[PDB]
Write a protein that binds this ligand. Structure first.
Ligand code: CLA
Ligand code: CLA
Ligand code: CLA
Ligand code: CLA
Ligand code: CLA
Ligand code: CLA
Ligand SMILES: C=Cc1c(C)c2cc3nc(c4c5[nH]c(cc6nc(cc1[nH]2)C(C)=C6CC)c(C)c5C(=O)[C@@H]4C(=O)OC)[C@@H](CCC(=O)OC/C=C(\C)CCC[C@H](C)CCC[C@@H](C)CCCC(C)C)[C@@H]3C
Ligand SMILES: CC(C)=CCC/C(C)=C\CC/C(C)=C\CC/C(C)=C/CC/C(C)=C\CC/C(C)=C\CC/C(C)=C\CC1=CC(=O)C(C)=C(C)C1=O
Ligand SMILES: CC1=C(/C=C/C(C)=C/C=C\C(C)=C\C=C/C=C(C)/C=C/C=C(C)/C=C/C2=C(C)CCCC2(C)C)C(C)(C)CCC1
Ligand SMILES: CC1=C(/C=C/C(C)=C/C=C\C(C)=C\C=C\C=C(C)\C=C\C=C(C)\C=C\C2=C(C)CCCC2(C)C)C(C)(C)CCC1
Ligand SMILES: CC1=C(\C=C/C(C)=C/C=C\C(C)=C\C=C\C=C(C)\C=C\C=C(C)\C=C\C2=C(C)CCCC2(C)C)C(C)(C)CCC1
Ligand code: OEC
Ligand SMILES: [Br-]
Ligand SMILES: [Br-]
Ligand SMILES: [Fe+2]
Lengths: 137, 30, 35, 340, 447, 82, 335
């Protein structure tokens, strides 16, 4: 009775509709996260480019808004920079990622729907130790 | 000074060394 | 020979030794807890 | 003569000798080794250090400890029945009651134990050079667990019983104290170093000097225990160093005694330093340099560099480390190099 | 019947004077155990490697070794089928069983003396030539393997060459380098930063072309030790004691455990960064590499950007007037590797090719090496000293470096232990001095 | 020299030892495991449940403000979590 | 009659010289002389040296930072990393200075020279019939010195981070490390503390008990430290008369019966852990640093519950950032 489902209750799409998580499907977002992103953005911050973070605000402002499952899903399918254009799958691994850094090949919808949850779930957990690296901790 | 002192307190650790390695009062086996 | 069993060299070992075997078992109960 | 009755028993040469000291050393030297272990795996100090102590909390052996009370406490000897817990092991516990309990007992238990050597040394009858040598750890503890806090704010900033707990303490001083630059401590080091070398220079100097006063190619059989006279001719060993390291011994009568000094000696040294610390009256700066630095953006010595690390290990540290003093350190204010 | 006539307990082991069929079958005993690990741990590595995940993100050190020869390879370094691996793994556990089968033998029912029973599989340490000979013999057994590679890279599937035209891909070394000066020149110079004794190898043929110069020399050593008795000088020096031999042949390993610990750490070639980790220096470069692109794309002009120290933000000269990465990354300018080389010029980095020619793949590869740098924790947890708990890979190059040292050292000190005490047997001091005749008591005491 | 040494050096080999002791260890091991298994430890020392550190919400730390009534604080700071 | 060289080699191996010029000594001596006299002078007027790459000469010294605890001999420049900087390189001696050329020159001589001691440390162990493992205990020493002068350097980028030879530079170098590797949170540094925090508690006893147990030869008429005339095959101090006490302090069996067990181990304690630490360092020379418990302890919701080792972190993050400020232009320090 600490990580209630009203906290696992995140916004999946832009429109404003909500989808809730289980104590279960959460671990996987994580288990996945570490298998999949650990390398960088650990604690919620990209090491390849500190300028960009996985914070709820950030994502929300991004374009297309990535503060929603479908969105972090869009990304995990097709990777583009902040603000509209420049498909960056030829660098940043994604289900596109022409079979590059295989860490991506395997995953599925059950997977992407969750990892993406993990990202929006975290800050709800970790106040903002989520976007801030080194200084916090 | 400050340095003159440092090089002195030192050069005597060198004398104090020479002195106990050659001016050692032999140890007597009796 | 004739030796006793409730010796002082006995009360000593039993002050720290017995609670310890309680401790290591208590600890062992934790290697599982979670959340 | 009932007095001599009690006596008679107590000091009767058992397996693990009891005696008069025992009425002190033993009890206290128990609740202490004890209380430490109790809280070590059962109590949390979340109410003073908002951190996890006990193994129950998931803590790791190293990270476990019976962390001192909240600085909000002061030096109150946090009695179980004192206006603190008002009588309530549970509360008394949460209020980190024990650390006072673990130090004072370990205190008197460290008392009873020096008296414990003196008892024996008198009974079997031998020079009190054991008990005399126990001043070293006596001072040390007293200095770092009693006078220090007392001279500072609360029992808080006093060492906390755990390893990562005391590992803390080191960098603490390096932080706000710059211990590493206090002449005294540089002798404490000196001692525990010279002494660790002696313990072994003489250590492997004996094993490799002794004679063939046994049969096999092994020495655990070689003459003793107290029979044949001396295994190592300090004459065949002597001439070896006086040609190798230049100056060797003569008269193990002093070698042993010089071996008493080195450690117990220097150890004591820092203990003074530490008393300087309770009073923050420490060796931090070198004015001669500050002024020569002030007016010269080109003047740099390890003196200075080190000095910074300190500021780092204090601006980043402090806030989460001294909660009672609600520190509000904005990311900007935060001192930190270029690119990091 | 020992412990009383035999010297000690811990040191109980060691009973061996002129010969012993228990100690012979004891090295054949252990030399078998060793085989056991090779396979067991191999079958424990394949028993794990995820379908396709960095070979180094998983604690694999053996599997990566098998890869370097060209087993399971794949264009780029990607395992094709989890089989070539399982072959050596089980063939070793069955090798291990064989080692087990007759060691315990020489060990419990095996004939004691090697003189009473056999007369050829029998020695004596003072035996100047018996020992001398066996030398050239195992030397020959090495002159053999010293060739396995020769035909493996030249005949049964060359060695994985990460220095391949299109990228990492097991190629077949057809032109081994057999130039006496270039392969004999490698060892003969280059100690420090300039280059490594031999941890300094550029191409995969200087190795195969040399492992050829080795398979003969040692092979031609046996026809020399098996064929001759010690010369006329070396008679002197050398304590042909039994123990001493353990030392002469021992403190050599200390040298190699070191010249090894440096190979896993620096050498990119024989230590394909794709099978192991990215060399400590390599990672440091990928650091700048990344942020240079990152920044250049954002419109910055790396060529002209001036550091904050005033040095050179992304680029600065070397004491050779070459061009190299700045920051702190400077310490590692000597580092070389396939992902960079093309982006390199005549006087070091080339301001041009670095500006546009900066092809799309070198970005992530040089990005991987950043994220996954040779740094970890005593309790696994890749990242700098104070990184929260998340990633947890610890470089193989890190474990193999740490490992081998710890051992490589104890050995040097192990060389001492014996090489100096064995110098006490041929002198009879070992066990202390003679309580009545002590050589310092018959000396004109200097004072 | 003189030694009022009781057995010891073998009482482990003792036939009645590893018997009446093959009854005591586990009667001790689990004895303690239950102090842990009940959750008893907690209520003994005050220690918190991995769920009972911060309230279900608020991000504060129950730092004992005062000295003379320290307990009263701890009381309400506890009741706190709910 | 033997030719001149035959004499030469007996004079170098003569167990007669005031001090043995062993074979190892023909290299040690010229070597150590070099190290020292260079250094001892550099220690006086050491021209501003620029350790790190950045051209910002940081030079503690005497005729420059005239203090004993400030100054030192400063390291090598990243610039020339792990590169060998032979004084005959710098197009000017003054160059050699900037780059701290004196550093290498000295450190290599003191390195190989002190091994020579390690070596010519056993040369009496043989040229004088007597157990040779004296130089073996000098392993805990030489090695460790290397671990902090050669290994870490081959480890990281360049000699730039090689325990500068100064009092404070020590402290500095110490700290750096503790911020780049959790060496205090290590079970290897521990073993040096194990033995050092041992040889101490211990040198204290054998010294203690040994003086605490001495016959009767003067009665404060003078000293008691005359109770042994050098050379006697007697043992001024009684053994079982000694043990009799400790055996009594801590239950018998716990005190040493045999002298051979006594002493000898007196090495056992130190040298063992002293090697370990020497290694602990030589280990974090490839970055197999101390345990990481940063956050480790967690909560139900996932709130972070600080381990003690968490604070210890900030005390590192602190310096991590400040260390060698302005000398790195990127976000992750791989050396
Ligand atoms: C002159 C005759 C002779 C020959 C040819 C050998 C050969 C060998 N001895 Mg040996 N030995 C001899 C006399 C000989 N010994 C005598 C007189 C004694 C004292 C009485 C010993 C005591 C001794 C000990 C204690 C040990 C050896 C070992 C070995 C092996 C070394 C392993 C190696 O090289 O890595 C292998 C790498 C290679 C590249 C080998 C190439 C393949 C060759 C050997 C073909 C062999 C075909 C056949 C044996 C199948 C493989 C053999 C198997 C070892 C793999 C090698 C097979 C070691 C061993 O392995 O045994 C357990 C070992 O520990 N010997
Ligand atoms: C349990 C103890 C142990 C274990 C598990 C290992 C395991 C390993 N060692 Mg090793 N080693 C050890 C103790 C151990 N060592 C000791 C005490 C020393 C003395 C310092 C060494 C010195 C050493 C060297 C110099 C090298 C290894 C290497 C290796 C790796 C290659 C396996 C092998 O070479 O197959 C045998 C066949 C191979 C083809 C492997 C490489 C072939 C070359 C390197 C052999 C050249 C001769 C060399 C001295 C023989 C090494 C055998 C030894 C490692 C057991 C493997 C992970 C190799 C590697 O590079 O690790 C980084 C390597 O080069 N070791
Ligand atoms: C390091 C290499 C080495 C060396 C120099 C020796 C040397 C010796 N071993 Mg031996 N041995 C070794 C490795 C070695 N062994 C290993 C690795 C094992 C376990 C796998 C054994 C198991 C073993 C046993 C059980 C016995 C010996 C015996 C002997 C002694 C005489 C037999 C013999 O050597 O035949 C010389 C070897 C040959 C002539 C090669 C012949 C190979 C043919 C093709 C096949 C050999 C038989 C095989 C088909 C069946 C194996 C079963 C076997 C156990 C009977 C001799 C001193 C004793 C012996 O037999 O003395 C008379 C003995 O009883 N060994
Ligand atoms: C690496 C190759 C090598 C080989 C082949 C040998 C071989 C030998 N050594 Mg040896 N040694 C080596 C390396 C080697 N050593 C190194 C690197 C060191 C330290 C630098 C030593 C230090 C050493 C000492 C002091 C002695 C030997 C001895 C011996 C001989 C006795 C065999 C023995 O006792 O083992 C059989 C089993 C053991 C020795 C016990 C090993 C397990 C130990 C006891 C661990 C105990 C577990 C416990 C947790 C330990 C806690 C840690 C604490 C001990 C520090 C044997 C010839 C003895 C001798 O003189 O005769 C030759 C002896 O007294 N060695
Ligand atoms: C693993 C390394 C190793 C090896 C190869 C040996 C080998 C040997 N030791 Mg030894 N020893 C070791 C480590 C080792 N030791 C260590 C670490 C210590 C410190 C405790 C010792 C202490 C020691 C002493 C005091 C003595 C020896 C002795 C011996 C010799 C006689 C063995 C014997 O009498 O046992 C008898 C065997 C048994 C009682 C049964 C053992 C069961 C077998 C051997 C194991 C089976 C292996 C595996 C599980 C089964 C494989 C299955 C296969 C058949 C298919 C033999 C050469 C004796 C000797 O004379 O040399 C100095 C001796 O007196 N050792
Ligand atoms: C003579 C003593 C001796 C003993 C008892 C062993 C025992 C063993 N060796 Mg081994 N080995 C030795 C000498 C010895 N070796 C020598 C001189 C060499 C030259 C290379 C090797 C080369 C070697 C290889 C390549 C391999 C082994 C393997 C092994 C087995 C793996 C266990 C291991 O820790 O050892 C490995 C080597 C050591 C352990 C060296 C010393 C380290 C000891 C202490 C092991 C850990 C104990 C540790 C110190 C506990 C206390 C620590 C201390 C701080 C208190 C084990 C049976 C492995 C095996 O056969 O497969 C499973 C294996 O692959 N050895
Ligand atoms: C490295 C730290 C250190 C420890 C671990 C230590 C430990 C010990 N030293 C002793 C003795 C000595 N030490 C001496 C000089 C020194 N001792 C030193 C440093 C240490 N000495 C320094 C180096 C000097 C040398 C320069 C003298 C010579 C003696 C003695 O002769 C004596 C001995 O004969 O030992 C065999 C033993 C006496 C036992 C006792 O008093 O019980 C009674 C006290 C008990 C049982 C209660 C403990 C008291 C303390 C205050 C309570 C603290 C409990 C927690 C803090 C536990 C800590 C664990 C966590 C913090 C992780 C004991 C084993
Ligand atoms: C000034 C400067 C350059 C540096 C700093 C100095 C500093 C920081 C502090 C000094 C601090 C103060 C005041 C006190 C420190 C007290 C502390 C004393 C430790 C003592 C160290 C010491 C005095 C000696 C150690 C000597 C040593 C390492 C080896 C000599 C060993 C020895 C005495 C004899 C060797 C020897 C032993 C033996 O048993 C046998 C049989 C034979 C034959 C031998 O030759
Ligand atoms: C390189 C190379 C190679 C190879 C190589 C080789 C093969 C080599 C060699 C070699 C070598 C490199 C060798 C060696 C060595 C030797 C030694 C190491 C020696 C020595 C010895 C000594 C030193 C000694 C002894 C002594 C002394 C010391 C003095 C006096 C006394 C006596 C005599 C005893 C190859 C291509 C394949 C790979 C890569 C490259
Ligand atoms: C003598 C001695 C010893 C030892 C020795 C040795 C020599 C060792 C070891 C060991 C060894 C040398 C061994 C071995 C072996 C092996 C075996 C016995 C095996 C088996 C197993 C198997 C065969 C398996 C596996 C598998 C398979 C089959 C395939 C896959 C699957 C599996 C994994 C199941 C001891 C210790 C007693 C001590 C004393 C001396
Ligand atoms: C508290 C208290 C008290 C008392 C107390 C006590 C009684 C304590 C104790 C105690 C104890 C008595 C505890 C304990 C313990 C122990 C333990 C828990 C242990 C352990 C562990 C260990 C340690 C193990 C193992 C090991 C090994 C085998 C390896 C290495 C080493 C070691 C040792 C770690 C009273 C009521 C008066 C009052 C209130 C408070
Ligand atoms: Mn001075 Ca090893 Mn910390 Mn960046 Mn450099
Ligand atoms: Br710095
Ligand atoms: Br940088
Ligand atoms: Fe002594």
């Amino acid at each position: 009775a600490e990580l209630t489902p009203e906290v696992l209750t995140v916004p999946l799409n832009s429109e404003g509709k909500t989808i809730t998580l289980t104590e279960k499907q959460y671990l996987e977002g994580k288990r996945l996260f570490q298998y999949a992103c650990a390398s960088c953005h650990v604690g919620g911050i990209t090491k390849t480019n500190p300028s960009l973070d996985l914070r709820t605000e950030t994502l929300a402002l991004a374009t297309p808004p990535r503060d929603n499952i479908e969105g972090l899903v869009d990304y995990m399918k097709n990777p583009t920079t902040y603000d509209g254009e420049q498909e960056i799958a030829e660098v940043h691994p994604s289900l596109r990622s022409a079979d590059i850094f295989p860490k991506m090949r395997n995953l599925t919808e059950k997977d992407l729907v969750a990892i993406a949850g993990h990202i929006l779930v975290e800050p709800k957990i970790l106040g903002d130790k989520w976007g801030g690296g080194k200084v916090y901790y | 000074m400050e340095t003159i002192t440092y090089v002195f307190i030192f050069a005597c650790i060198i004398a104090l060394f020479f002195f106990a390695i050659f001016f050692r009062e032999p140890p007597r086996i009796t | 020979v004739s030796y006793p069993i409730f010796t002082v060299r006995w009360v000593a070992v039993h002050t720290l030794a017995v609670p310890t075997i309680f401790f290591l078992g208590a600890i062992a109960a934790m290697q599982f807890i979670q959340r | 003569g009932w007095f001599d009755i009690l006596d008679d028993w107590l000091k009767r040469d058992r397996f693990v000798f009891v005696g008069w000291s025992g009425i002190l050393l033993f009890p206290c030297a128990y609740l202490a080794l004890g209380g430490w272990l109790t809280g070590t795996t059962f109590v949390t100090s979340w109410y003073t250090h908002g951190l996890a102590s006990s193994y129950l909390e998931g803590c790791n052996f190293l990270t476990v400890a019976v962390s001192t009370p909240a600085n909000s406490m002061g030096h109150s000897l946090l009695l179980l029945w004192g206006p603190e817990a008002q009588g309530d092991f549970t509360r008394w516990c949460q209020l980190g009651g024990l650390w006072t309990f673990i130090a004072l007992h370990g205190a008197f238990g460290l008392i009873g134990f020096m008296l414990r050597q003196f008892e024996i040394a008198r009974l079997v009858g031998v020079r009190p050079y054991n008990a005399i040598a126990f001043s070293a750890p006596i001072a040390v503890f007293v200095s770092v667990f009693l006078i220090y806090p007392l001279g500072q704010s609360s029992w808080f900033f006093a060492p906390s019983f755990g390893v990562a707990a005391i590992f803390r303490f080191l960098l603490f001083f390096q932080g706000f104290h710059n211990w590493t630059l206090n002449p005294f401590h540089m002798m404490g080091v000196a001692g525990v170093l010279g002494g660790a070398l002696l313990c072994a220079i003489h250590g492997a100097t004996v094993e490799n000097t002794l004679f063939q006063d046994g049969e096999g190619a092994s020495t655990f059989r070689a003459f003793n225990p107290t029979q044949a006279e001396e295994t190592y001719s300090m004459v065949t060993a002597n001439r070896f160093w006086s040609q190798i390291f230049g100056i060797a011994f003569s008269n193990k009568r002093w070698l042993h005694f010089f071996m008493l000094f080195v450690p117990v000696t220097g150890l004591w040294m820092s203990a003074i330093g530490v008393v300087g610390l309770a009073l923050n009256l420490r060796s931090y700066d070198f004015i001669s340099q500050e002024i020569r630095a002030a007016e010269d953006p080109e003047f740099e010595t390890f003196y200075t560099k080190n000095l910074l690390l300190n500021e780092g290990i204090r601006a980043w540290m402090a806030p989460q480390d001294q909660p009672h003093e609600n520190f509000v350190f904005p990311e900007e204010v935060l001192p930190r190099g270029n690119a990091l | 019947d020992q412990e009383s006539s035999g010297f000690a307990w811990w040191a109980g082991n060691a009973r061996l004077i002129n010969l012993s069929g228990k100690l012979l079958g004891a090295h054949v005993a252990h030399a078998g155990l060793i085989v056991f690990w090779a396979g067991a741990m191999t079958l424990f590595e394949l028993a794990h490697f995820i379908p396709e995940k960095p070979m180094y993100e998983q604690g694999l050190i053996l599997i990566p070794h098998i890869a370097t020869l060209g087993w399971g390879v794949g264009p780029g370094g990607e395992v094709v089928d989890t089989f070539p691996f399982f072959v050596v793994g089980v063939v070793h556990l069955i090798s291990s069983a064989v080692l087990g089968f007759g060691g315990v033998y020489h060990a419990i029912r095996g004939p004691e003396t090697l003189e009473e029973y056999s007369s050829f599989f029998g020695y004596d340490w003072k035996d100047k030539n018996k020992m001398t000979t066996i030398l050239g013999f195992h030397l020959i057994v090495l002159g053999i393997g010293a060739l396995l590679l020769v035909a493996k890279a030249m005949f049964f599937g060359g060695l994985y060459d990460t220095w391949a035209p299109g990228g990492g891909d097991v190629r077949v070394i057809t032109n081994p380098t057999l130039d006496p000066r270039v392969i004999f020149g490698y060892l003969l110079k280059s100690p420090f930063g300039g280059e490594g004794w031999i941890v300094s190898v550029n191409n995969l043929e200087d190795v195969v072309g040399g492992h050829i110069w080795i398979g003969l020399i040692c092979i031609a050593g046996g026809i020399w030790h098996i064929l001759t008795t010690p010369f006329g000088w070396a008679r002197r020096a050398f304590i042909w004691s039994g123990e001493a031999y353990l030392s002469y042949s021992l403190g050599a390993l200390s040298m190699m455990g070191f010249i090894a610990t440096c190979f896993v750490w620096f050498n990119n070639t024989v230590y394909p960064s794709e099978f192991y980790g990215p060399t400590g220096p390599e990672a440091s470069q990928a650091q700048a590499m990344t942020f240079l692109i990152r920044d250049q794309k954002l419109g910055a002009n790396v060529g002209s950007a001036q550091g904050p120290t005033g040095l050179g933000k992304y680029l600065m000269r070397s004491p050779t007037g070459e061009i190299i990465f700045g920051g702190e990354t400077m310490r590692f300018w000597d580092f070389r590797g396939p992902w960079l080389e093309p982006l390199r010029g005549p006087n070091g980095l080339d301001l041009n090719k670095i500006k546009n020619d900066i092809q799309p793949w070198q970005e992530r590869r040089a990005a991987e090496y950043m994220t996954h740098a040779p740094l970890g924790s005593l309790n696994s947890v890749g990242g700098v000293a104070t990184e929260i708990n998340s990633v947890n890979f610890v470089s193989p190059r890190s474990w193999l470096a740490t490992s081998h040292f710890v051992l490589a050292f104890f050995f040097l000190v192990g060389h001492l232990w014996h090489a100096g005490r064995a110098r006490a047997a041929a002198a009879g001091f070992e066990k202390g001095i003679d309580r009545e005749s002590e050589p310092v008591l018959s000396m004109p005491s200097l004072d | 020299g003189t030694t009022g040494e009781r057995p010891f050096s073998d009482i482990i080999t003792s036939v009645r030892y590893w018997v009446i002791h093959s009854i005591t260890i586990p009667a001790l091991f689990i004895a303690g495991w239950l102090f842990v298994s009940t959750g008893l430890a907690y209520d003994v020392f005050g220690t918190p449940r991995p769920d009972s550190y911060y309230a279900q919400e608020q991000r504060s730390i129950p730092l004992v403000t005062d000295r003379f009534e320290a307990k009263q604080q701890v009381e309400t700071f506890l009741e706190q979590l709910k | 009659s033997a030719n001149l060289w035959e004499r030469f080699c007996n004079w170098v191996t003569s167990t007669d010289n005031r001090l043995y010029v062993g074979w190892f000594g023909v290299i040690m001596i010229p070597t150590l002389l070099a190290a020292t006299i260079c250094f001892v002078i550099a220690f006086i007027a050491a021209p501003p040296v620029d350790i790190d790459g950045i051209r910002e000469p940081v030079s503690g010294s005497l005729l420059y930072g005239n203090n004993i605890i400030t100054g030192a001999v400063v390291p090598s420049s990243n610039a020339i990393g792990l590169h060998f900087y032979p004084i005959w390189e710098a197009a000017s001696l003054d160059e050699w200075l900037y780059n701290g050329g004196p550093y290498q020159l000295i450190i290599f001589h003191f390195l190989l020279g002190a091994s020579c001691y390690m070596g010519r440390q056993w040369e009496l162990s043989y040229r004088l019939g007597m157990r040779p493992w004296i130089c073996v205990a000098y392993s805990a020493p030489l090695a460790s010195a290397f671990a902090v002068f050669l290994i870490y350097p081959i480890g990281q980028g360049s000699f730039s981070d090689g325990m500068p030879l100064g009092i404070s530079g020590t402290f500095n170098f110490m700290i750096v490390f503790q911020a780049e590797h959790n060496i205090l949170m290590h079970p290897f540094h521990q073993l040096g503390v194990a033995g050092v925090f041992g040889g101490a508690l211990f040198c204290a006893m054998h010294g203690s008990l040994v003086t605490s147990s001495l016959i009767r030869e003067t009665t404060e008429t003078e000293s008691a430290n005359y109770g042994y005339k050098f050379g006697q095959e007697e043992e001024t101090y009684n053994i079982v008369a000694a043990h009799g006490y400790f055996g009594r302090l801590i239950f018998q069996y716990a005190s040493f019966n045999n002298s051979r067990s006594l002493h000898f181990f007196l090495a056992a304690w130190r040298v063992v852990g002293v090697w370990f630490a020497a290694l602990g360092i030589s280990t974090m020379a490839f970055n197999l640093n101390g345990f990481n418990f940063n956050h480790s302890v967690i909560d139900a919701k996932g709130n972070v519950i600080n381990t003690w080792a968490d604070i210890i972190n900030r005390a590192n993050l602190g310096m991590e950032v400040m260390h060698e400020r302005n000398a790195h232009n990127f976000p992750l320090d791989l050396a």
